[PDB]
Paper text:
If the HK incorporates a REC domain (REC-1) is denoted as hybrid histidine kinase (hHK), and the first His-Asp phosphotransfer event occurs in the same polypeptide chain. Then, HPt protein containing a phosphorylatable His shuffles the phosphoryl group from the phosphorylatable Asp in the REC-1 domain to the phosphorylatable Asp in the REC domain of an RR (REC-2) in two more phosphotransfer steps.
Motivated by our findings and to analyze the Leu-Thr switch in another fungus, we set up crystallization trials with the REC-1 domain of C. albicans (RECCal_Sln1) in the presence of phosphomimetic, either isolated or together with Cal_Ypd1. We obtained crystals for RECCal_Sln1 isolated which contained four molecules in the AU. Also, the overall structure was similar to REChHK6 (rmsd of 0.7 Å in 115 residues), but, the loop β4–α4 was ordered and well defined although its conformation slightly differed from REChHK6, as well as the position of α4. The structure of RECCal_Sln1 also provided two interesting features. In this way, all four molecules of RECCal_Sln1 lack the Leu-Thr switch so Thr in β4 (T1329) and Phe in β5 (F1348) were oriented away from the active center.
Author numbering: 1240 to 1367
Amino acid sequence: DISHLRVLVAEDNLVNQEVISRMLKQEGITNLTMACNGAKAIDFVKESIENNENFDLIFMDVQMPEVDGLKATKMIRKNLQYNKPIIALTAFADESNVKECLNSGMSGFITKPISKTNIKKVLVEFLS
Ligand SMILES: [Mg+2]
């Protein structure tokens, strides 16, 4: 009952992209877009708003080259006016970097490595 969702995953680690994609597919997601950095992420969101192929949810790796997840999240929130959930993927969450994430406009976070339970929880909490 979740094949209606369209999900964007921004992750600069290709092994990680495959892992999260497989998890999302196992949960029933069929509409998935991968972004290798924050610049690609911004580009994909802009298109989705224009074309009514809107993303229901974004998973945003915090640390990526060229444009990181924090900069991408700020652009997506404030420039593109995207107001749906953005979930940070973080290798390390401490007081300083969490405040930075929240200030960027993140809706929540998962510490890497992610588990299927984390995906299920995000879906029920944000997209029920
Ligand atoms: Mg990364």
